[PDB]
Amino acid sequence: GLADFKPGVQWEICIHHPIKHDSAADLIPTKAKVWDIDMGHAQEFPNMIPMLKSAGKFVICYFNAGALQDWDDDKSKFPKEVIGHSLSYPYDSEEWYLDIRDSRVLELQTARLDIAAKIGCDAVDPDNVDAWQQDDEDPTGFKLKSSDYTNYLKNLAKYAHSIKTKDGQPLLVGQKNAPEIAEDLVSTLDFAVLESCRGNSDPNEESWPFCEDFQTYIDAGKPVLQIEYPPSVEKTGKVSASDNKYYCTAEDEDKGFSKIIKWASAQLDGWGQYCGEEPFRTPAAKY
Protein backbone atom coordinates (compact mmCIF):
# COMPACT_ATOMS: atom_id res chain seq x y z
CA GLY A 1 0.00 0.00 0.00
CA LEU A 2 1.60 3.20 -1.29
CA ALA A 3 -1.73 4.64 -0.06
CA ASP A 4 -0.70 3.68 3.46
CA PHE A 5 2.76 5.30 3.01
CA LYS A 6 2.10 8.46 4.99
CA PRO A 7 2.70 9.98 8.45
CA GLY A 8 1.66 7.65 11.26
CA VAL A 9 2.04 4.35 9.36
CA GLN A 10 3.15 1.35 11.48
CA TRP A 11 6.45 -0.30 10.53
CA GLU A 12 9.19 -2.83 11.34
CA ILE A 13 12.89 -2.73 10.46
CA CYS A 14 15.04 -5.88 10.50
CA ILE A 15 18.37 -5.57 8.71
CA HIS A 16 20.70 -7.63 10.94
CA HIS A 17 19.23 -10.96 9.80
CA PRO A 18 16.77 -11.98 7.05
CA ILE A 19 13.14 -12.12 8.12
CA LYS A 20 11.30 -15.44 8.10
CA HIS A 21 8.79 -15.49 5.24
CA ASP A 22 7.35 -18.98 4.72
CA SER A 23 3.85 -17.51 5.22
CA ALA A 24 2.14 -14.24 6.14
CA ALA A 25 1.95 -15.49 9.76
CA ASP A 26 5.77 -15.14 10.00
CA LEU A 27 5.48 -11.34 9.43
CA ILE A 28 5.40 -10.48 13.11
CA PRO A 29 4.40 -7.84 14.06
CA THR A 30 1.32 -8.19 11.84
CA LYS A 31 0.27 -4.56 12.38
CA ALA A 32 3.46 -3.33 10.65
CA LYS A 33 2.47 -2.20 7.14
CA VAL A 34 5.93 -0.89 6.17
CA TRP A 35 8.90 -3.29 6.26
CA ASP A 36 12.51 -2.10 6.03
CA ILE A 37 14.73 -5.04 5.11
CA ASP A 38 18.28 -5.45 3.85
CA MET A 39 18.37 -5.36 0.04
CA GLY A 40 20.97 -8.15 0.03
CA HIS A 41 18.82 -10.42 2.23
CA ALA A 42 15.92 -9.88 -0.21
CA GLN A 43 18.14 -11.14 -3.04
CA GLU A 44 19.48 -14.11 -1.01
CA PHE A 45 15.90 -15.24 -0.24
CA PRO A 46 13.99 -14.56 -3.48
CA ASN A 47 10.47 -15.18 -2.10
CA MET A 48 10.92 -12.60 0.69
CA ILE A 49 9.64 -9.52 -1.16
CA PRO A 50 6.93 -11.56 -2.99
CA MET A 51 5.71 -12.76 0.42
CA LEU A 52 5.69 -9.20 1.81
CA LYS A 53 3.76 -7.92 -1.25
CA SER A 54 1.26 -10.81 -1.03
CA ALA A 55 0.52 -9.66 2.57
CA GLY A 56 -0.04 -6.05 1.47
CA LYS A 57 3.25 -4.61 2.78
CA PHE A 58 5.18 -1.59 1.54
CA VAL A 59 8.81 -2.62 1.19
CA ILE A 60 11.82 -0.41 1.95
CA CYS A 61 15.25 -1.76 0.95
CA TYR A 62 18.19 -0.77 3.14
CA PHE A 63 21.61 -0.29 1.59
CA ASN A 64 24.77 1.55 2.56
CA ALA A 65 25.09 4.71 0.41
CA GLY A 66 27.90 6.46 2.26
CA ALA A 67 30.15 3.50 3.20
CA LEU A 68 31.58 0.43 1.51
CA GLN A 69 31.48 -2.93 3.30
CA ASP A 70 33.95 -5.82 3.06
CA TRP A 71 31.18 -8.28 2.10
CA ASP A 72 29.56 -6.11 -0.66
CA ASP A 73 29.15 -8.07 -3.92
CA ASP A 74 30.40 -5.00 -5.87
CA LYS A 75 33.32 -4.12 -3.54
CA SER A 76 36.02 -4.87 -6.15
CA LYS A 77 34.49 -2.26 -8.50
CA PHE A 78 35.17 0.66 -6.12
CA PRO A 79 38.58 2.35 -6.72
CA LYS A 80 40.89 2.76 -3.73
CA GLU A 81 40.82 6.53 -4.29
CA VAL A 82 37.14 6.83 -3.25
CA ILE A 83 37.53 4.64 -0.12
CA GLY A 84 38.29 6.66 3.02
CA HIS A 85 38.60 6.08 6.72
CA SER A 86 37.36 3.02 8.49
CA LEU A 87 34.18 3.64 10.47
CA SER A 88 36.54 2.84 13.47
CA TYR A 89 39.60 4.81 12.17
CA PRO A 90 42.43 4.52 13.05
CA TYR A 91 41.56 0.80 13.32
CA ASP A 92 41.00 -1.25 10.15
CA SER A 93 37.48 -2.69 9.99
CA GLU A 94 34.98 -4.12 7.51
CA GLU A 95 33.42 -0.70 6.73
CA TRP A 96 34.91 2.45 5.14
CA TYR A 97 33.41 5.83 4.22
CA LEU A 98 33.07 6.70 0.52
CA ASP A 99 33.91 9.92 -1.27
CA ILE A 100 30.29 10.62 -2.24
CA ARG A 101 31.32 13.60 -4.40
CA ASP A 102 32.86 11.17 -6.89
CA SER A 103 31.07 10.30 -10.15
CA ARG A 104 32.32 6.69 -9.95
CA VAL A 105 30.63 6.24 -6.56
CA LEU A 106 27.37 7.66 -7.93
CA GLU A 107 27.46 5.25 -10.92
CA LEU A 108 28.00 2.23 -8.65
CA GLN A 109 25.27 3.35 -6.22
CA THR A 110 22.76 3.91 -9.04
CA ALA A 111 23.37 0.32 -10.20
CA ARG A 112 22.26 -0.71 -6.67
CA LEU A 113 19.09 1.40 -7.15
CA ASP A 114 18.47 -0.56 -10.39
CA ILE A 115 18.61 -3.78 -8.34
CA ALA A 116 16.20 -2.36 -5.75
CA ALA A 117 13.74 -1.51 -8.53
CA LYS A 118 14.14 -4.92 -10.23
CA ILE A 119 13.62 -7.04 -7.06
CA GLY A 120 10.37 -5.41 -5.86
CA CYS A 121 11.50 -2.72 -3.40
CA ASP A 122 9.07 0.22 -3.22
CA ALA A 123 11.71 2.48 -1.66
CA VAL A 124 15.32 2.58 -0.49
CA ASP A 125 16.84 3.56 2.86
CA PRO A 126 20.39 4.83 2.10
CA ASP A 127 22.77 4.70 5.06
CA ASN A 128 25.71 6.82 6.22
CA VAL A 129 24.93 10.17 4.54
CA ASP A 130 25.96 12.28 7.57
CA ALA A 131 29.77 12.08 7.72
CA TRP A 132 30.83 15.59 6.70
CA GLN A 133 33.68 17.30 8.56
CA GLN A 134 32.34 18.91 11.75
CA ASP A 135 34.23 21.03 14.32
CA ASP A 136 37.65 20.17 12.83
CA GLU A 137 36.96 16.37 13.06
CA ASP A 138 36.77 14.60 9.67
CA PRO A 139 35.12 11.11 9.67
CA THR A 140 35.85 10.22 6.04
CA GLY A 141 39.24 11.77 5.31
CA PHE A 142 37.78 13.61 2.28
CA LYS A 143 36.92 16.84 4.21
CA LEU A 144 33.33 16.66 2.94
CA LYS A 145 30.80 19.45 3.52
CA SER A 146 27.19 18.90 4.54
CA SER A 147 26.17 20.26 1.11
CA ASP A 148 28.14 17.41 -0.54
CA TYR A 149 25.73 14.95 1.13
CA THR A 150 22.73 17.08 0.10
CA ASN A 151 23.98 17.01 -3.53
CA TYR A 152 24.67 13.27 -3.42
CA LEU A 153 21.22 12.47 -2.04
CA LYS A 154 19.65 14.73 -4.67
CA ASN A 155 21.56 12.74 -7.31
CA LEU A 156 20.41 9.39 -5.85
CA ALA A 157 16.83 10.70 -5.72
CA LYS A 158 16.94 12.07 -9.30
CA TYR A 159 17.95 8.58 -10.47
CA ALA A 160 15.40 6.66 -8.35
CA HIS A 161 12.61 9.05 -9.36
CA SER A 162 13.35 8.21 -13.02
CA ILE A 163 12.84 4.42 -12.73
CA LYS A 164 9.77 2.37 -11.86
CA THR A 165 9.25 -0.30 -9.23
CA LYS A 166 7.62 -3.65 -9.79
CA ASP A 167 4.34 -2.10 -8.60
CA GLY A 168 4.71 0.40 -11.46
CA GLN A 169 5.49 3.62 -9.51
CA PRO A 170 8.68 5.72 -9.06
CA LEU A 171 11.29 4.31 -6.64
CA LEU A 172 11.23 6.34 -3.38
CA VAL A 173 14.29 7.46 -1.40
CA GLY A 174 14.62 8.19 2.31
CA GLN A 175 16.78 10.54 4.36
CA LYS A 176 18.77 8.70 7.04
CA ASN A 177 19.56 10.97 10.01
CA ALA A 178 21.58 14.08 8.98
CA PRO A 179 19.18 16.56 10.69
CA GLU A 180 21.25 19.59 9.59
CA ILE A 181 20.22 19.04 5.95
CA ALA A 182 16.59 17.96 6.44
CA GLU A 183 15.32 21.42 5.42
CA ASP A 184 17.46 21.20 2.25
CA LEU A 185 16.18 17.70 1.33
CA VAL A 186 12.50 17.53 2.37
CA SER A 187 11.24 18.66 -1.06
CA THR A 188 13.39 16.05 -2.79
CA LEU A 189 13.28 12.93 -0.60
CA ASP A 190 10.21 10.86 0.20
CA PHE A 191 10.51 10.01 3.93
CA ALA A 192 13.02 9.94 6.78
CA VAL A 193 14.54 7.19 8.90
CA LEU A 194 15.94 8.41 12.22
CA GLU A 195 18.11 6.89 14.97
CA SER A 196 18.13 8.43 18.43
CA CYS A 197 16.37 11.68 17.50
CA ARG A 198 15.38 11.83 21.19
CA GLY A 199 19.08 11.83 22.14
CA ASN A 200 20.32 9.59 24.93
CA SER A 201 18.90 8.99 28.43
CA ASP A 202 22.51 9.08 29.70
CA PRO A 203 22.98 12.89 29.63
CA ASN A 204 26.81 12.46 29.50
CA GLU A 205 26.49 10.91 26.01
CA GLU A 206 27.11 13.47 23.23
CA SER A 207 23.65 13.09 21.70
CA TRP A 208 21.82 16.34 20.97
CA PRO A 209 18.11 15.71 20.30
CA PHE A 210 16.95 16.43 16.76
CA CYS A 211 13.40 15.06 16.33
CA GLU A 212 12.11 18.62 15.76
CA ASP A 213 14.25 18.94 12.60
CA PHE A 214 12.07 16.29 10.89
CA GLN A 215 8.64 17.87 11.57
CA THR A 216 9.12 19.41 8.09
CA TYR A 217 8.67 15.90 6.63
CA ILE A 218 5.37 15.41 8.51
CA ASP A 219 4.30 18.85 7.15
CA ALA A 220 5.01 17.51 3.62
CA GLY A 221 2.86 14.38 4.13
CA LYS A 222 6.01 12.20 4.29
CA PRO A 223 6.49 9.53 7.01
CA VAL A 224 9.20 9.80 9.65
CA LEU A 225 10.28 6.31 10.64
CA GLN A 226 11.79 6.78 14.09
CA ILE A 227 14.16 4.26 15.76
CA GLU A 228 15.08 4.58 19.42
CA TYR A 229 17.69 2.41 21.20
CA PRO A 230 17.12 2.62 24.99
CA PRO A 231 20.58 1.81 26.51
CA SER A 232 18.98 -0.59 29.00
CA VAL A 233 18.00 -3.01 26.19
CA GLU A 234 21.55 -3.77 25.00
CA LYS A 235 22.67 -4.05 28.64
CA THR A 236 19.80 -6.03 30.24
CA GLY A 237 17.57 -7.29 27.38
CA LYS A 238 14.64 -5.10 28.61
CA VAL A 239 13.57 -1.43 28.47
CA SER A 240 14.00 0.04 31.97
CA ALA A 241 11.19 2.06 33.54
CA SER A 242 13.30 5.23 33.30
CA ASP A 243 14.14 4.55 29.62
CA ASN A 244 10.46 3.99 28.82
CA LYS A 245 9.74 7.44 30.29
CA TYR A 246 12.62 9.04 28.34
CA TYR A 247 11.82 7.50 24.95
CA CYS A 248 8.01 6.92 25.02
CA THR A 249 6.44 9.84 26.98
CA ALA A 250 4.54 12.04 24.48
CA GLU A 251 6.46 15.14 23.38
CA ASP A 252 5.80 17.70 20.64
CA GLU A 253 9.14 17.22 18.88
CA ASP A 254 8.42 13.66 17.57
CA LYS A 255 4.63 14.00 17.38
CA GLY A 256 3.36 12.17 14.29
CA PHE A 257 6.51 10.09 13.83
CA SER A 258 6.31 6.32 13.52
CA LYS A 259 8.28 5.28 16.62
CA ILE A 260 9.81 1.84 17.25
CA ILE A 261 12.18 0.65 19.98
CA LYS A 262 15.01 -1.62 18.80
CA TRP A 263 17.97 -3.39 20.43
CA ALA A 264 21.06 -1.45 19.17
CA SER A 265 22.20 0.29 15.96
CA ALA A 266 24.65 -2.60 15.37
CA GLN A 267 21.87 -5.15 16.12
CA LEU A 268 18.76 -4.14 14.15
CA ASP A 269 17.43 -7.68 14.47
CA GLY A 270 13.83 -8.89 14.83
CA TRP A 271 13.42 -7.79 18.46
CA GLY A 272 11.30 -4.68 18.81
CA GLN A 273 8.76 -2.84 20.89
CA TYR A 274 6.08 -0.22 20.39
CA CYS A 275 5.42 2.33 23.12
CA GLY A 276 2.62 1.10 25.40
CA GLU A 277 3.09 -2.56 24.38
CA GLU A 278 5.11 -5.63 25.31
CA PRO A 279 7.99 -6.49 22.96
CA PHE A 280 7.76 -8.69 19.88
CA ARG A 281 10.29 -10.57 17.79
CA THR A 282 10.29 -10.89 14.01
CA PRO A 283 11.57 -14.47 13.45
CA ALA A 284 14.67 -15.11 11.32
CA ALA A 285 15.00 -17.06 8.10
CA LYS A 286 17.52 -19.93 8.24
CA TYR A 287 20.51 -20.14 5.85
Residue numbers in the entry: 31 to 317
Published text:
Endo-galactosaminidases are an underexplored family of enzymes involved in the degradation of galactosaminogalactan (GAG) and other galactosamine-containing cationic exopolysaccharides produced by fungi and bacteria. Whereas the fungal enzyme belongs to family GH114, the two bacterial enzymes do not lie in the current GH families but instead define a new family, GH191. The TIM-barrel core structure with fully conserved active-site residues and a negatively charged substrate crevice is conserved among all the families. The putative active-site residues (Asp156/Glu225 for TmGH191, Asp323/Glu391 for Env-GH191 and Asp157/Glu225 for FsGH114) overlap well with the experimentally verified nucleophile and general acid/base Asp189/Glu247 in Ega3, Asp196/Glu222 in Sph3 and Asp160/Glu223 in PelAH.
The fungal GH114 enzyme from the filamentous fungus F. solani, which shows a sequence identity of 33% to Ega3 from A. fumigatus, could also be produced in soluble form. For FsGH114 no activity was seen using the isolated Pel substrate and further studies are necessary to establish the exact substrate specificity of FsGH114. Similarly, within the GH114 family, F. solani GH114 overlaps with Ega3 (AfGH114) with an r.m.s.d. of 1.49 Å over 218 residues, with a sequence identity of 35%. FsGH114 also lacks the first and sixth α-helices but has a C-terminal extension folding into two strands forming a short antiparallel β-sheet. One of these tyrosines or both could play the same role as the tryptophans in the other three enzymes (Tyr121 is poorly defined in the present structure). The acceptor side of the substrate crevice in FsGH114 is flanked by two elongated loops comprising residues 164–168 between β4 and α4 and C-terminal to β6 residues 231–239. Thus, overall the crevice of FsGH114 is deeper and more pronounced compared with the bacterial GH191 enzymes, but also with Ega3. To gain better insight into the substrate interactions, we docked the substrate into Env-GH191 and FsGH114. In both cases up to seven subsites could be identified. Whereas the Env-GH191 binding crevice seem to better fit the galactosamine oligomer, the FsGH114 crevice can accommodate either an acetylated or a non-acetylated GAG oligomer equally well.
